[PDB]
Symmetry: C2
Subunit: 49 residues, 2 copies
């Protein structure tokens, strides 16, 4: 039923949703007031650290 998705370390019913902002930044949620804009480095997977 293509509804089981593999998250970073667990299984979730929703895919990893990445939202792109107008200023070239990428955030987890629509509002830039939240989100903890995603980073990358030394391991890939675009973890928010």
């Amino acid at each position: 039923a293509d509804t089981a998705y593999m998250s970073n370390g667990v299984l979730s019913d929703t895919p990893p949703t990445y939202y792109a902002q107008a200023d070239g930044s990428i955030t987890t949620t629509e509002d830039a007031a939240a989100g903890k804009l995603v980073y990358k480095g030394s391991d890939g997977k675009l973890t928010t650290d």
Copy 2:
């Protein structure tokens, strides 16, 4: 239509959505990974600063 609600400084269609975690923290998104844990103080309105 009860679909226009006043946010901090802008009129938006959604209510201010605040999520409560098990550990007592209050976050703006479901996942603890993002959210920018909310705060209160010196003016109310529960600003995220």
